[PDB]
């Protein structure tokens, strides 16, 4: 019963399964390690059936649902053991959500036909306020200010949350019992986005103090602090490698961080209307880059506050392709509310025609790893699904899903089924107010809940 | 926690070794003793501790590296 024999037994069994499903055997085995080669190998954009997606909206009591994180077990080719923490949790999908009401909630989403079913929750409050008022003493078990982000560890054993309280609490997935609390140890170190390195325990946290902090959850210890952004680091993303990317919000710069080489690549949009109008011979200037997701180890996409969805490549500093006003323009302000004057024509003038119109912001943007499809979210009332061209030089609008109504704070995708036939479930957190703040005017029909949509492949 | 990163790795079969630049990040710690560094490099590169040698270490001004 040597360990080399055990791998041999599992290895032979795994081949037996592939033979049953079926060149093809050789082809699949390459795909098993295609992840290591940082290139897109999941070309399933055409095969998706957006029109037939089964959409549903599930209401939640928590006000202003702020973020959602999904955990999917993955069978590990090296050891042929599932990523599930324990024996009880085979093939179970979990989704964790956090809200401004200081409540963390876990859901089960294994049954695609059924709605998320709450299992356990932990809620914070004023009980946990620190008395010491020193940053290194901010080590209370529960939250006391708005929770902004949540991420589920790839090993399925921990889920970590952070918010405006300047703390990084890591919970036990089984019980949602806090096991360790890591202060960011800065006056303005408010955590804004969390991402795990795929299939690893390393965590990258973006803080409002203009720095990215890195952690190793298994050791419960901080590793490094990265510097260089010119404004707050609103969002961060990561993949199998250590190349995390970040967007600095108003500084209008996206930076890729090579943690081993200790170097960073700076990318800037640098688009100006006078040329764009000249090239044409409504264009709005970008104000911030708020969201980011890495399509690939050599590509990533960003969404700005002028409705621009940009595709980037590591080689080129400028965007390779841009999709201006992706979500359209906001509704015009009502003429009965613009001015108090009695005459209608007087009120119409204050609208100033079309100069006051502004575009939707890209509140959420998610790309399936190593695929040619990504999902963009805003409060236009629909989730748009895009497809990146085969040459990875442009993307087009695959389809839309109109079920979601409200501000899409975060998007996630979870998949099930055999390798050939695969069903994707799109889970999006919907809130009445933007995650960072309450700027946005209330959207009619918005509700706090978890938007869900199941999409099936056929061909 | 303390991190070790190797860079500029050159394999020198003439002397039968691998030479590299070692960067130690040690927040909240004076520095790492050469023996401990030898143990960690040894297990990382899958060689005996006797076969690992480190020298020429200068802590960067302000500490932490």
């Amino acid at each position: 019963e040597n360990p080399a024999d055990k791998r041999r037994r599992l290895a032979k069994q795994y081949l037996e399964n592939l033979k049953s499903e079926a060149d093809i055997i050789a082809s699949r085995l390459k795909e098993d390690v295609a992840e290591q080669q940082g290139r897109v190998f999941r070309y399933f954009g055409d095969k998706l059936l957006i029109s037939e997606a089964k959409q549903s909206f599930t209401r939640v009591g928590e006000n202003n649902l702020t973020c959602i994180s999904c955990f999917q077990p993955v069978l590990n080719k090296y050891t042929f053991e599932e990523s599930s923490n324990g024996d009880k949790n085979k093939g179970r999908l979990f989704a964790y959500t956090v809200s401004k009401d200081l409540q963390l909630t876990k859901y089960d989403i294994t049954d695609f036909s059924k709605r998320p079913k709450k299992l356990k929750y932990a809620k914070g409050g004023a009980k946990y306020i620190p008395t010491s008022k020193h940053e290194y003493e901010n080590t209370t078990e529960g939250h006391y200010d708005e929770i902004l982000t949540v991420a589920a560890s790839p090993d399925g054993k921990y889920v970590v949350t952070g918010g405006r309280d300047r703390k990084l609490i890591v919970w036990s997935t089984e019980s949602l019992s806090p096991v360790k609390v890591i202060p960011t140890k800065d006056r303005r170190g408010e955590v804004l986005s969390l991402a795990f390195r795929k299939n690893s325990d390393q965590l990258y946290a973006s803080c409002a103090d203009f720095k990215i902090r890195t952690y190793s959850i298994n050791q419960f210890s901080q590793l490094e602090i990265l510097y260089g952004h010119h404004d707050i680091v609103e969002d961060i993303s990561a993949l199998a490698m250590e190349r995390c990317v970040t967007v600095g919000a108003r500084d209008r710069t996206a930076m890729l961080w090579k943690i081993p080489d200790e170097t960073r690549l700076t990318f800037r949009g640098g688009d100006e209307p006078q040329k764009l109008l000249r090239r044409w011979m409504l264009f709005f200037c970008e104000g911030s880059i708020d969201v980011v997701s890495m399509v690939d180890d050599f590509h990533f996409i960003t969404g700005s506050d002028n409705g621009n969805i940009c595709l980037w490549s590591l080689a080129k500093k400028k965007p390779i392709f841009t999709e201006r006003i992706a979500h359209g323009i906001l509704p015009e302000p009502s003429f009965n509310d613009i001015s108090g004057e009695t005459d209608e024509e007087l009120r119409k003038r204050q609208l100033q025609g079309k100069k006051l119109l502004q575009p939707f912001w890209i509140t959420s943007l998610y790309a399936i790893p190593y695929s040619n499809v990504f999902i963009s979210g805003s409060w236009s009332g629909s989730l748009k699904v895009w497809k990146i061209s085969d040459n990875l030089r442009s993307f087009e609008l695959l389809g839309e899903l109109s079920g979601a109504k409200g501000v899409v704070t975060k998007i996630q995708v979870v998949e099930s089924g055999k390798h050939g036939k695969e069903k994707f479930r799109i889970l999006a957190s919907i809130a009445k107010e933007h995650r960072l703040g309450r700027w946005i005017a209330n959207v009619s029909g918005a509700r706090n809940g978890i938007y869900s949509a199941v999409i099936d492949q056929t061909g | 926690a303390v991190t070790i990163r190797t860079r500029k790795v050159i394999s020198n079969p003439l002397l039968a070794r691998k030479q590299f630049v070692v960067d130690v990040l040690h927040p909240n710690r004076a520095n790492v003793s050469k023996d401990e560094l030898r143990e960690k490099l040894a297990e990382v590169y899958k060689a005996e501790k006797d076969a690992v040698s480190v020298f020429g270490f200068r802590t960067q001004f302000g500490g932490g590296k």
């Binding site: 210890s221 590793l223 081993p260 | 303390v2 991190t3 860079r7 790795v9 960690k40």
Partner: peptide, 8 residues
């Protein structure tokens, strides 16, 4: 390319 580790 080199290798990476963290301890303690």
């Amino acid at each position: 390319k080199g290798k990476n580790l963290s301890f303690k």
